[PDB]
Design a protein around this ligand. Structure first.
Ligand SMILES: CC(C)CCC[C@@H](C)[C@H]1CC[C@H]2[C@@H]3CC=C4C[C@@H](O)CC[C@]4(C)[C@H]3CC[C@]12C
Ligand SMILES: CC(C)CCC[C@@H](C)[C@H]1CC[C@H]2[C@@H]3CC=C4C[C@@H](O)CC[C@]4(C)[C@H]3CC[C@]12C
Ligand SMILES: CC(C)CCC[C@@H](C)[C@H]1CC[C@H]2[C@@H]3CC=C4C[C@@H](O)CC[C@]4(C)[C@H]3CC[C@]12C
Ligand SMILES: CCCCCCCC/C=C\CCCCCCCC(=O)OC[C@H](O)CO
Ligand SMILES: CCCCCCCC/C=C\CCCCCCCC(=O)OC[C@H](O)CO
Ligand SMILES: CCCCCCCC/C=C\CCCCCCCC(=O)OC[C@H](O)CO
Ligand SMILES: NCCc1c[nH]c2ccc(O)cc12
Ligand SMILES: [Mg+2]
Length: 370
């Protein structure tokens, strides 16, 4: 006889906590993007869809995962509900990683194509990209019901419902989890470098505009102002229209010979430059702030699923050499480290965004009026 309820009830109280923090955390994120209007961009739109994936993992996968621990890891439901539960577990995790990849991808293309980002601002464009990812994730996870329902040996390992098939655990791990992991760690690295270069390029054009504002207010002739405005106008085009015609206003005074009159115009440009420099120089500050926080989302996904990901692959490499009972007893812990990651995507936003933090606080006092 089997399917016995046991006294594994340290686990029952601990796993219940993780389910609510997932469900309550990611509901507040879905409510934040749906209601708060400082969050209406493509990156925050993905984070909602990430939190829909996290929350449905809290509803559908994590209670059943708890329920198995309550019946000694012998599987209490119907046997054709084993292959459904693996399919949802793997679908929500595959949808998370391909979101996290696609954010880091969409963020990088936003910097290399500033003009394209204005065109790609559309919520419809964002939703199309999400709907690309979910239908990729349903595409990748689809062997688990199509084959597993047909053969109980691919989803049961001795009354235990788990992905027993080893070509599913191997090929899936590299198709669905190092192809979008590669693209995430390449494009996060290059996003840091594109915002390092353009911050470094703005300090270049800060010091050459500030250098020619020394030159014009020293100068004697209309050739030492004309050249010095020609080097301002060229290196003001390198920060892109607003200021160029005001330099062209100053350029025609140097081209006629009105030097004291061209020098006075250049002093009027000074404050125009400090306005346009404090603006775009706070823009790079904000993107590098956002890139840092999205990195913590990216880093904690990778770290918390990493003990589950390595040990599941060591189940397949030492299929002979190792304690299958100990590897089975570690994966049962290691899956819940990765489940816990559904609870921490919301908490990150709270610590690191005052817009998410304010919104969460108001909803806890039941205040939706923005
Ligand atoms: C249980 C677990 C988490 C809970 C939710 C957590 C947060 C909120 C946001 C609040 O503003 C309204 C209630 C609501 C939606 C709760 C309803 C009940 C709930 C679903
Ligand atoms: C269960 C899943 C499957 C479809 C999902 C919904 C799909 C569409 C939207 C509209 C969006 O603006 C807010 C979230 C919301 C309402 C989702 C909430 C969670 C959901 C109901
Ligand atoms: C991080 C997780 C990785 C690096 C660690 C955590 C748990 C570890 C496993 C723990 C138990 C066993 C069974 C033993 O008979 C051989 C080593 C082996 C297979 C370990 C290999 C390395 C391992 C998979
Ligand atoms: C709102 C924006 C995005 C959410 C996209 C839809 C959220 C729901 C995900 C799709 C889904 O639930 O698919 C599972 C099913 O098993 C497939 O057959
Ligand atoms: C995912 C595709 C849908 C698959 C649906 C499979 C449902 C199976 C179910 O409910 O269980 C049947 C049970 O085994 C009979 O006693
Ligand atoms: C094309 C389908 C490629 C996927 C081939 C196997 C599908 C199973 C799958 O995606 O598994 C994920 C992995 O096992 C997580 O541990
Ligand atoms: N999401 C990976 C499949 C899965 C679901 N529950 C599990 C429990 C144990 C295990 O080894 C694997 C699983
Ligand atoms: Mg200098």
């Amino acid at each position: 006889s089997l399917l016995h309820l046991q006294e594994k009830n340290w686990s029952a109280l601990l796993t219940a906590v993780v389910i609510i923090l997932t469900i309550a955390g990611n509901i507040l994120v879905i409510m934040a993007v749906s209601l708060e209007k400082k969050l209406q961009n493509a990156t925050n739109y993905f984070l909602m869809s990430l939190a829909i994936a996290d929350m449905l993992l809290g509803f559908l996968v994590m209670p059943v995962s708890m329920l198995t621990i309550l019946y000694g890891y012998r599987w209490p439901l119907p046997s054709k509900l084993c292959a459904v539960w693996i399919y949802l577990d793997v679908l929500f995790s595959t949808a998370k990683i391909w979101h996290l990849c696609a954010i880091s991808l969409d963020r990088y293309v936003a910097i290399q194509n500033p003009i394209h980002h204005s065109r790609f601002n559309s919520r419809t464009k964002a939703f199309l990209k999400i709907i690309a990812v979910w239908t990729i994730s349903v595409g990748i996870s689809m062997p688990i019901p199509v084959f597993g329902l047909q053969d109980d040996s691919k989803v049961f390992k001795e009354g235990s419902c788990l992905l027993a098939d080893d070509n599913f655990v191997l090929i899936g791990s590299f198709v669905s989890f190092f192809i979008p992991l590669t693209i995430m760690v390449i494009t996060y690295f290059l996003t840091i470098k594109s915002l390092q270069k353009e911050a470094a390029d703005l300090e270049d054009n800060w010091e050459t505009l500030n250098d020619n504002l020394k030159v014009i207010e020293k100068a004697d002739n209309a050739a030492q102002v004309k050249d010095a405005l020609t080097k301002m106008r060229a290196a003001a085009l390198d920060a892109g229209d607003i200021l160029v015609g005001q330099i062209d206003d100053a350029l025609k005074l140097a081209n006629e010979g009105k030097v004291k009159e061209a020098q006075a115009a250049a002093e009027q440009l000074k404050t125009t430059i400090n306005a346009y420099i404090q603006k775009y120089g706070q823009s790079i500050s904000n993107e590098q702030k956002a890139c840092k926080v999205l990195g913590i989302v990216f880093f904690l996904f990778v770290v918390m699923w990493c003990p589950f990901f390595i040990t599941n692959i060591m189940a397949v490499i030492c299929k002979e050499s190792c304690n299958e009972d100990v590897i089975g007893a570690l994966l049962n812990v290691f899956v819940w480290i990765g489940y816990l990651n559904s609870a921490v995507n919301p908490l990150v936003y709270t610590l690191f965004n005052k817009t998410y933090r304010s919104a969460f606080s108001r909803y806890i006092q039941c205040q939706y009026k923005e």
